[PDB]
Design a protein around this nucleic acid. Sequence first.
RNA 1: GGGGGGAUGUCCGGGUCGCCCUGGGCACCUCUCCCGGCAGCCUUCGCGGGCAGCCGUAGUCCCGGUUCAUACGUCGCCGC
Lengths: 51, 543, 359, 113, 125, 125, 99, 108
Amino acid sequence: MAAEVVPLPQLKLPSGPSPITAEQRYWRSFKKQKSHTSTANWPISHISFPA
Amino acid sequence: IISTFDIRPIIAELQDIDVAVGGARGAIYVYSNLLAHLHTLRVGTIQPRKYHWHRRAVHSVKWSGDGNYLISGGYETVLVLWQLDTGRVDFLPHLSAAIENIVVSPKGSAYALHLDDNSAMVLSTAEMKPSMYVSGIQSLVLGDRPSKDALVRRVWRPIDEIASPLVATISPQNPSHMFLCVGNGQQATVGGGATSTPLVQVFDISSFQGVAKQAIARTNPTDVNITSEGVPIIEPTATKLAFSHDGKWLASIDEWQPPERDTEAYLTGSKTQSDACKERREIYLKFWEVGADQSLELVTRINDAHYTKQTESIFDLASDPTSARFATIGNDGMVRFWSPKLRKRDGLMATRPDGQPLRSWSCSRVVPLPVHERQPYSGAITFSEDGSILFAAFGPPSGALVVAIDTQTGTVRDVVSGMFKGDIRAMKSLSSCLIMLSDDLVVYDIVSDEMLASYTLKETSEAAKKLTQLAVNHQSRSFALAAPIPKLKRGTKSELLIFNIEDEEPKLVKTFSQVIISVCAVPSSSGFVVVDSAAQVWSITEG
Amino acid sequence: SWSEWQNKAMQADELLQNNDIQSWEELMAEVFKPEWEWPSSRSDYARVDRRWVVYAINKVFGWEGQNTGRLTCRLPESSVLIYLVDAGHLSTSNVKSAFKDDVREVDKVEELIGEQLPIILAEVDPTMELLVGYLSGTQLGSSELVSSIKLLLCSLGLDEHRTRGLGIAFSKLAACPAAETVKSLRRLFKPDEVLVLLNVLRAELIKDGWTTRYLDIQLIADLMSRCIDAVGLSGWMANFFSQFQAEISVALEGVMEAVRLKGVIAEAANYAKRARRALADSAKGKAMTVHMSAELPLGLKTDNKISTERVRSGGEIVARSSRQIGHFISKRRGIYSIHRISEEMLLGAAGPTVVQEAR
Amino acid sequence: MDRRTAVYEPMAGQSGRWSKVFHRRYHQHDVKAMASFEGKGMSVVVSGGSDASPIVLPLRALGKEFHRTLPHLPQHPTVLSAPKARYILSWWENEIRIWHLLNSAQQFLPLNL
Amino acid sequence: LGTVLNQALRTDDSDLLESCLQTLIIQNTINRMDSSLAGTLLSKLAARMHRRPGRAFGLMRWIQWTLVAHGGALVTQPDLINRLTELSRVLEERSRGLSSLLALKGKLDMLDAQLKYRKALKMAG
Amino acid sequence: LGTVLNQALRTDDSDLLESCLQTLIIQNTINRMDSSLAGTLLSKLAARMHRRPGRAFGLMRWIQWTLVAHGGALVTQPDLINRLTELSRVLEERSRGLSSLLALKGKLDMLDAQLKYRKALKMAG
Amino acid sequence: LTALRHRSALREALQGRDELSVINILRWAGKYVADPRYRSICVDVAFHLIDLYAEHVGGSAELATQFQQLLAKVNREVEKAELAIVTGGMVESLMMSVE
Amino acid sequence: SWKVSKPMGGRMSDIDPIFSQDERHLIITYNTSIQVYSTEDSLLVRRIALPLTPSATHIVSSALSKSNPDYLWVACSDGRIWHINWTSGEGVDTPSTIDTKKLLDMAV
RNA sequence: GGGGGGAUGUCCGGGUCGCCCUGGGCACCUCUCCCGGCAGCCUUCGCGGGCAGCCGUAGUCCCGGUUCAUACGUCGCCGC
């Protein structure tokens, strides 16, 4: 039973009383930003997509 | 200094012998031909071939079969193979413990190893996997043959001693299994001046085989066992380990401080090296979920369970027999109740990848304990058999006191003082009475507020006074203590006392030829299970 | 052996109904091991047993059941009572074990008995030497200690036996945890009695010398902080608190100054000790590196003598050869040194004189 | 080049099979050259390396006698002094370095050294 | 002020050292002090600090600057090393309650600012 | 800055909260802050103090003045004591390590004293 | 570094350095004493560096800044640790008054 | 009322664990026990318990009889020698002393 | 480290004044026993015990100023 060579495990350090949650990273993962301006700087009324 | 030797015959006559002497400094000296050198007053110059790889003493050397290879094994947990036709060397490096003995099969195929952690593995050659594995109880043993690297006056000379009792629980939901704390090997456990037992094993009682093994504290089997100076490393010892009411949780405490030789540069004023090592302690409190296949999984780890200006020692933990709740008593004074909640930050729960939610343990209750300082305090706790009341002995010298605390509310239901002569060793709670031992042993009923039986135990050394301990049965109301008969050494005797709850006469008085290191209670049935130094296990039962 | 104690208790019951206190007191003297002379040590008392302790408190003290009772002196003039005080058996667990019958319905029993008992000892003796002995002898909870401090401040706030116990109870109530001290102090104290106590603690702080300078602690800060949190805003809500925090800031600056001077002075003292060792050995002639001038060196490092042992592989210990010791000494010389050999060396008696270049 | 010297003798039994009897690090740098001699009651092997110290090993009594490190400094002292002028003097590759000492030793019985 | 500190310590005077104690010139004073005489200055500063707890805003600059320029002369005097190693032992004993006394400073910085709060609110209402 | 702080703590902003935290002003801000957002401010200050250790002075000043101004405003809350519990946890971690750090501060103060002494010598030489 | 404290070899790891890498480890120690999540390991490394390399501080001026700049941040971390135990008293006062 | 079972388990002694003939069983000698396991399934086939009782007497050596297999030679520290046969237990209750001071080793 | 002595070198009252001594300060060599370690040889199964012990400091003919380190099975890309 030769034990398999394991590397050094990184330390699970404790987290403060407001960690970045799974859903906060999930909504931060909407990464790539493209800002398309409207014609003549018109305010955008409504966006929509079909079901 | 000769540790071992293996002779091979060069042959239906006997033409020559080849001797391989494994010495205590680490080398293996191969004397190639002896009968043709000492057959012929005058002899020619004989000069052994030196093969030096092991740092410490080489425990076993054997020639292998045809005579091409010289297999060997020492403290460094590595089976080494000297190629001996070339100059090369190939090794099976990371076993569990020290290679204490090897043999070669009648054919050339199999090797059989006696590993220092009470084990034997028949390996096959160049598959190099154990085709036969047999494990034992692996507890601390006072060895008969002392040690093979205690011959040459090392930095820490290995001593056959037992400093503390074995940490073991029989597990409910499967009372044939016994969880107990072990190190990598026996010699690697006792080496370094402290017990370094960062592993547990599950050991079958009904058929005496070590079923499985797992790490609790941090361990590095794949790193070097010895520092560059020559001291063996110590690993965090699992001091307190006790098991939940359900059969589904397990809470352990493991402590580690740096060695006294190591500080040397943290000393500023009146700080000695012991004070610096005591300041730099690491006391983790880890909660384990026990699976169906005896596989432990972490759920939480608390880095500082009792904290003030510095970290505080944790003296005992206990499981509530009616709920999933662990009480821990510390050196700050307070008793903390830990309970499992689900992981849920803002209503969005966190679940495992298969779907079940992640449980996590946290401190449900804090109870500060009252102190009564007349002009180094240790603790002990136990629940009732019903729950709903937790008895907490708080332990300055001679003046010490037990506090009976409710569980549903954090208020103190009772306090009882003046019942301890020295420092408290342990305390258990049978059906109505507290059975507690200090220098005295007292059964003290709290439903009557009256001590029934009181004994003044015989005065002995501090090691034996540390190695006395008891255990209650909780099914048939009987308790059992254990005390070696009066520094500790090999030939000592111990005697255990079976008491009932009601009388003062001991119901069974049996002495043993070796000192018993642990007593435990089987949870399903009556009786006890005791584990000896020369590590054999035997069960005591009424009827 | 319960029946023997039961017969002895029935005999003491017969002595109680005879109302002959003297042979009862002599029987208690025989059990505890009239004249009634004392050993002069609070510690050196012989060990007695719990049932006789329980019977002693049951005969001495008394209870009134009207849904709440009152301990009273059935024997207010008793050597048995002063022995219970000096031997410290007057604990709440002891008196509850003595009175398990009448108190089993009573609630808040620790608070009632801890409020009532030091008052009872103080009304027994107006000189309260028995109260100071009780403070020094018995395991005491925070309610008992705050009532005892109330009693000593009632007495004050021939003339030192009270201030001794005033010093004792501060140490005990500093040993107690914060929760019981705060709740018992808030119960049993008035918010001007606390101001009296905070003037006593200011007398223990300023007269001790913390605010006072030089050219012209942990057990009192706990008491001050616990009293301040026990009053809180409901008691006070002037310039008294501004001068209060001024003197506490002054004492804090003193303690921080003591920290800095502690570190510096301890390091200089340890260097001076080891340098004294090395200079003694260099005067013997072992030729180590020592600093010459009177300022401190940059690295506070002294060269030790070479140990007689060597750590071989793998960890073993062997004797140092004098050859290797000479090699390390040859390392320990500098690049220039004057090494005077004397005629006494050439005769074989003395040692040389080495003066080496300061590195 | 691992400053290592290893000694091999033939394995007993089979012919033409050598094996390393023992190795030891005699030098402090690599062992670049060595040569043996065996005659008039003297079997030595002299190994010179990069630490300028020729090390003489006994050949036939190897493992039975200590070796010997010959001096790396030359046999001629190569240090000369004018004592009336207190000049010490030493020469190597093409330079002559002359030091003057300016004072006695009786004066100094460490900032001035 | 270099020559007033020399004479005040050789005679073990009580008054003349204090005349120089209350008054960068202080640093240039002790760099020219005789070193066996400099240990006499440390003996009395450790004598007053050991007998009673207190503070001194000027002596923190004084004691440290002498232990650097004239701490290497401490090897010559075996009496002063033992006096300084019992001095740094008792200065630990003042240091143990620094944590509990800082929490006392917190409550007084809380209540005094709250008593001033209601008094401002009576003039605000 | 009271209404701005009210907006930031009421709609869980970061830009408004940081631009009002980076800046008398602090006392007026916490005195004009709403009572119900005080626990939200405590939690959002404990979070920044854990996540970044270099901002401890200003954040302890903010927490100090909040606990001065709205003390009983947190007691009339009382089922939300867990924000004070997380605050106690963060400050306990901040005050971890103090005895060893004081020892190391003394070990460095000796080196700084010797370096300043040799600079004071080298300027006059 | 925790593995090098657990295996007894932090002194061995720090004892063989030269000037620039001592400055590098001092710069890491100064930068990362601030986090109390590894203040202990970082202070231990600074202990061993003071014990090992405090002799060349007049020899090299750039290391003499890096010992002074590490006292400069250790001096600001007692004030942070004293203000957090000042403020920890006020939180302790409020939880007493809730009762 | 209470009874104590006979001791089971054991610590594996440093005497070499001997292979059987035809390599199918392994004979491991503990303190106070000698038991034969099978090499294939790693289940024990026999446990020959050995009465040790004189504080520290230990099993000194053990070897197969080289004249005939399926025999043993087990020797203690004091003079005691057993000639048991594995796959059975004939020989435990009949030892043979040797009149030693203390038996340090034996080889067959 | 102490308990103590024989002897080195020294100033302050000093002494008929010399050998130095008493009173104070002392640093060293040597002797003496207890302190911490290390080995041998008898006794006993061990535990322990007994006997004569060396080391706690300094530089060597040459020279231990050495000897000593933990495998294979398989690599790459991207995703959750």
